[PDB]
Design a protein around this ligand. Sequence first.
Ligand code: 3ML
Ligand code: 3ML
Lengths: 115, 109
Amino acid sequence: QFEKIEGRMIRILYLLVKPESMSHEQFRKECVVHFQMSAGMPGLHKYEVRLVAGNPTDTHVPYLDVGRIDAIGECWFASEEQYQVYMESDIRKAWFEHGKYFIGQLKPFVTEELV
Amino acid sequence: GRMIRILYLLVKPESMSHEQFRKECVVHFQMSAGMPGLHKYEVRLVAGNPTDTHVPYLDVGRIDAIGECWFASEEQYQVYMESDIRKAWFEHGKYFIGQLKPFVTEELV
Ligand SMILES: CC1=CC(=O)O[C@H]1CC(=O)O
Ligand SMILES: CC1=CC(=O)O[C@H]1CC(=O)O
Protein backbone atom coordinates (compact mmCIF):
# COMPACT_ATOMS: atom_id res chain seq x y z
CA GLN A 1 0.00 0.00 0.00
CA PHE A 2 2.95 2.39 0.68
CA GLU A 3 4.49 1.62 -2.72
CA LYS A 4 1.13 2.03 -4.38
CA ILE A 5 0.50 5.48 -2.82
CA GLU A 6 4.08 6.49 -3.49
CA GLY A 7 3.63 5.61 -7.16
CA ARG A 8 0.70 8.02 -7.51
CA MET A 9 2.61 11.02 -6.04
CA ILE A 10 3.56 14.04 -8.15
CA ARG A 11 6.53 12.63 -10.12
CA ILE A 12 8.94 14.40 -12.41
CA LEU A 13 11.35 12.38 -14.58
CA TYR A 14 14.51 14.02 -15.91
CA LEU A 15 16.86 13.14 -18.80
CA LEU A 16 20.38 14.42 -17.93
CA VAL A 17 23.18 15.06 -20.42
CA LYS A 18 26.64 15.80 -18.91
CA PRO A 19 28.57 18.95 -19.80
CA GLU A 20 30.42 18.39 -23.06
CA SER A 21 33.78 18.91 -21.44
CA MET A 22 33.21 16.97 -18.19
CA SER A 23 34.59 13.45 -18.14
CA HIS A 24 32.29 10.49 -17.63
CA GLU A 25 34.33 9.64 -14.53
CA GLN A 26 33.62 13.02 -13.02
CA PHE A 27 29.94 13.08 -14.07
CA ARG A 28 29.33 9.80 -12.24
CA LYS A 29 30.89 11.23 -9.09
CA GLU A 30 28.77 14.41 -9.39
CA CYS A 31 25.58 12.28 -9.74
CA VAL A 32 26.44 10.62 -6.40
CA VAL A 33 27.09 14.04 -4.81
CA HIS A 34 23.73 15.22 -6.19
CA PHE A 35 21.96 12.29 -4.56
CA GLN A 36 23.75 12.90 -1.26
CA MET A 37 22.65 16.55 -1.41
CA SER A 38 19.04 15.50 -1.84
CA ALA A 39 18.98 13.99 1.69
CA GLY A 40 16.59 15.88 3.92
CA MET A 41 15.50 18.25 1.08
CA PRO A 42 12.37 20.18 2.31
CA GLY A 43 9.25 19.00 0.48
CA LEU A 44 10.90 16.11 -1.38
CA HIS A 45 9.68 12.62 -0.73
CA LYS A 46 12.25 10.72 -2.88
CA TYR A 47 15.02 11.39 -5.37
CA GLU A 48 16.67 8.78 -7.54
CA VAL A 49 19.48 9.13 -10.09
CA ARG A 50 20.80 6.43 -12.35
CA LEU A 51 23.36 6.25 -15.15
CA VAL A 52 22.35 5.25 -18.69
CA ALA A 53 24.50 2.05 -19.12
CA GLY A 54 23.12 0.87 -22.39
CA ASN A 55 21.18 1.86 -25.43
CA PRO A 56 19.77 -1.29 -27.09
CA THR A 57 19.27 -0.18 -30.65
CA ASP A 58 17.67 -3.35 -31.89
CA THR A 59 14.01 -2.48 -31.40
CA HIS A 60 10.87 -4.36 -32.49
CA VAL A 61 9.12 -1.01 -32.70
CA PRO A 62 10.61 1.80 -34.83
CA TYR A 63 13.57 3.19 -32.92
CA LEU A 64 13.39 6.72 -31.45
CA ASP A 65 16.75 8.54 -31.52
CA VAL A 66 17.05 11.17 -28.82
CA GLY A 67 20.82 11.45 -28.88
CA ARG A 68 23.04 10.54 -25.94
CA ILE A 69 21.47 10.69 -22.50
CA ASP A 70 23.86 10.17 -19.63
CA ALA A 71 21.65 9.82 -16.56
CA ILE A 72 18.00 9.71 -15.51
CA GLY A 73 16.73 11.54 -12.40
CA GLU A 74 13.34 11.41 -10.75
CA CYS A 75 11.61 13.30 -7.96
CA TRP A 76 8.50 12.37 -5.95
CA PHE A 77 6.41 14.96 -4.02
CA ALA A 78 3.69 13.78 -1.72
CA SER A 79 1.34 16.73 -2.24
CA GLU A 80 1.00 20.12 -3.87
CA GLU A 81 1.83 21.80 -0.52
CA GLN A 82 5.06 19.79 -0.30
CA TYR A 83 6.02 20.61 -3.83
CA GLN A 84 5.59 24.28 -2.84
CA VAL A 85 7.78 23.88 0.28
CA TYR A 86 10.44 22.45 -2.08
CA MET A 87 10.00 25.15 -4.73
CA GLU A 88 10.45 27.87 -2.08
CA SER A 89 13.38 26.27 -0.28
CA ASP A 90 16.85 27.85 -0.14
CA ILE A 91 18.18 24.31 0.26
CA ARG A 92 16.68 23.28 -3.12
CA LYS A 93 18.22 26.42 -4.57
CA ALA A 94 21.68 25.28 -3.40
CA TRP A 95 21.00 21.78 -4.84
CA PHE A 96 20.18 23.36 -8.19
CA GLU A 97 23.50 25.32 -8.02
CA HIS A 98 25.19 21.92 -7.90
CA GLY A 99 23.00 20.88 -10.84
CA LYS A 100 24.28 23.78 -12.93
CA TYR A 101 27.82 22.45 -12.45
CA PHE A 102 27.35 18.83 -13.57
CA ILE A 103 24.21 18.89 -15.77
CA GLY A 104 24.89 20.11 -19.28
CA GLN A 105 21.29 19.81 -20.64
CA LEU A 106 18.04 18.62 -18.99
CA LYS A 107 14.59 17.47 -20.15
CA PRO A 108 11.85 17.22 -17.41
CA PHE A 109 8.65 15.20 -17.87
CA VAL A 110 5.83 15.62 -15.39
CA THR A 111 4.14 12.22 -15.37
CA GLU A 112 0.60 11.07 -14.77
CA GLU A 113 -0.12 7.66 -13.25
CA LEU A 114 -2.75 5.63 -15.15
CA VAL A 115 -3.48 2.96 -12.50
CA GLY B 1 22.99 -6.93 -6.40
CA ARG B 2 20.33 -4.63 -7.75
CA MET B 3 17.41 -5.23 -10.07
CA ILE B 4 17.95 -4.72 -13.82
CA ARG B 5 15.90 -1.69 -14.93
CA ILE B 6 15.06 -0.58 -18.42
CA LEU B 7 13.34 2.75 -19.00
CA TYR B 8 11.38 3.45 -22.19
CA LEU B 9 10.30 6.63 -23.98
CA LEU B 10 7.08 5.89 -25.92
CA VAL B 11 5.59 7.86 -28.84
CA LYS B 12 2.10 6.88 -29.98
CA PRO B 13 1.34 5.93 -33.63
CA GLU B 14 0.24 8.76 -35.91
CA SER B 15 -2.86 6.73 -36.70
CA MET B 16 -3.90 6.89 -33.05
CA SER B 17 -5.48 9.62 -30.96
CA HIS B 18 -4.13 10.64 -27.56
CA GLU B 19 -7.22 8.97 -26.02
CA GLN B 20 -6.78 5.73 -27.93
CA PHE B 21 -3.19 5.66 -26.77
CA ARG B 22 -4.04 6.17 -23.08
CA LYS B 23 -6.50 3.31 -23.17
CA GLU B 24 -3.87 1.07 -24.84
CA CYS B 25 -1.30 2.00 -22.17
CA VAL B 26 -3.79 0.69 -19.54
CA VAL B 27 -4.34 -2.48 -21.59
CA HIS B 28 -0.56 -2.97 -21.87
CA PHE B 29 -0.24 -2.65 -18.10
CA GLN B 30 -3.06 -5.16 -17.51
CA MET B 31 -1.44 -7.62 -19.95
CA SER B 32 1.86 -7.49 -18.03
CA ALA B 33 0.47 -8.97 -14.79
CA GLY B 34 2.34 -12.16 -13.94
CA MET B 35 4.64 -11.85 -16.97
CA PRO B 36 7.36 -14.60 -16.76
CA GLY B 37 10.67 -13.20 -15.58
CA LEU B 38 9.30 -9.69 -14.98
CA HIS B 39 9.41 -8.20 -11.52
CA LYS B 40 7.41 -4.99 -12.24
CA TYR B 41 6.12 -2.93 -15.23
CA GLU B 42 5.06 0.65 -14.95
CA VAL B 43 3.61 2.95 -17.57
CA ARG B 44 2.80 6.68 -17.07
CA LEU B 45 1.62 9.40 -19.40
CA VAL B 46 3.68 12.51 -19.98
CA ALA B 47 1.30 15.21 -18.62
CA GLY B 48 3.63 18.18 -18.68
CA ASN B 49 6.71 19.49 -20.40
CA PRO B 50 8.03 22.35 -18.35
CA THR B 51 10.82 24.46 -19.94
CA ASP B 52 11.73 26.67 -16.94
CA THR B 53 14.87 24.50 -16.48
CA HIS B 54 17.73 26.97 -15.50
CA VAL B 55 20.27 24.54 -17.04
CA PRO B 56 19.96 24.38 -20.87
CA TYR B 57 16.66 22.77 -21.96
CA LEU B 58 16.94 19.52 -23.91
CA ASP B 59 14.34 19.07 -26.71
CA VAL B 60 13.70 15.40 -27.46
CA GLY B 61 10.44 15.98 -29.29
CA ARG B 62 7.02 14.86 -28.08
CA ILE B 63 7.14 11.86 -25.79
CA ASP B 64 3.70 10.43 -24.93
CA ALA B 65 4.43 7.93 -22.16
CA ILE B 66 7.20 6.53 -19.99
CA GLY B 67 7.46 2.77 -19.50
CA GLU B 68 9.79 0.89 -17.14
CA CYS B 69 10.63 -2.79 -16.54
CA TRP B 70 12.33 -4.33 -13.54
CA PHE B 71 13.97 -7.77 -13.52
CA ALA B 72 15.29 -9.36 -10.33
CA SER B 73 18.33 -10.95 -12.03
CA GLU B 74 19.82 -11.70 -15.42
CA GLU B 75 18.33 -15.24 -15.19
CA GLN B 76 14.84 -13.72 -14.89
CA TYR B 77 15.53 -11.36 -17.75
CA GLN B 78 16.39 -14.35 -19.91
CA VAL B 79 13.25 -16.25 -18.85
CA TYR B 80 11.32 -13.11 -19.93
CA MET B 81 13.17 -12.93 -23.27
CA GLU B 82 12.33 -16.60 -24.03
CA SER B 83 8.71 -16.39 -23.06
CA ASP B 84 5.89 -16.68 -25.64
CA ILE B 85 3.56 -14.46 -23.51
CA ARG B 86 6.28 -11.72 -23.64
CA LYS B 87 6.37 -12.10 -27.39
CA ALA B 88 2.55 -11.71 -27.52
CA TRP B 89 2.78 -8.66 -25.22
CA PHE B 90 5.30 -7.11 -27.64
CA GLU B 91 2.80 -7.66 -30.52
CA HIS B 92 0.42 -5.45 -28.55
CA GLY B 93 3.27 -2.99 -28.25
CA LYS B 94 3.59 -2.85 -32.02
CA TYR B 95 -0.04 -1.79 -32.19
CA PHE B 96 0.08 1.20 -29.75
CA ILE B 97 3.75 2.24 -29.72
CA GLY B 98 4.80 4.21 -32.86
CA GLN B 99 8.43 4.82 -31.77
CA LEU B 100 10.40 3.67 -28.70
CA LYS B 101 13.69 4.54 -27.03
CA PRO B 102 15.06 2.05 -24.35
CA PHE B 103 17.61 2.98 -21.71
CA VAL B 104 19.25 0.25 -19.61
CA THR B 105 20.09 1.98 -16.33
CA GLU B 106 22.74 1.47 -13.66
CA GLU B 107 22.31 2.25 -9.93
CA LEU B 108 24.71 4.68 -8.31
CA VAL B 109 23.55 4.58 -4.73
C1 3ML C 1 14.90 18.44 -9.94
C2 3ML C 1 16.21 17.74 -10.28
C3 3ML C 1 16.40 16.49 -10.70
C4 3ML C 1 17.76 16.34 -10.85
O1 3ML C 1 18.34 15.34 -11.27
O2 3ML C 1 18.49 17.43 -10.47
C5 3ML C 1 17.51 18.48 -10.08
C6 3ML C 1 17.61 19.62 -11.13
C7 3ML C 1 18.88 20.50 -11.02
O3 3ML C 1 19.65 20.25 -10.08
O4 3ML C 1 18.98 21.47 -11.83
C1 3ML D 1 9.55 -3.77 -22.77
C2 3ML D 1 8.38 -2.82 -22.94
C3 3ML D 1 8.16 -1.63 -22.35
C4 3ML D 1 6.96 -1.19 -22.83
O1 3ML D 1 6.37 -0.16 -22.45
O2 3ML D 1 6.37 -2.05 -23.70
C5 3ML D 1 7.28 -3.20 -23.85
C6 3ML D 1 7.76 -3.23 -25.31
C7 3ML D 1 6.68 -3.64 -26.32
O3 3ML D 1 5.58 -3.93 -25.95
O4 3ML D 1 6.99 -3.57 -27.53
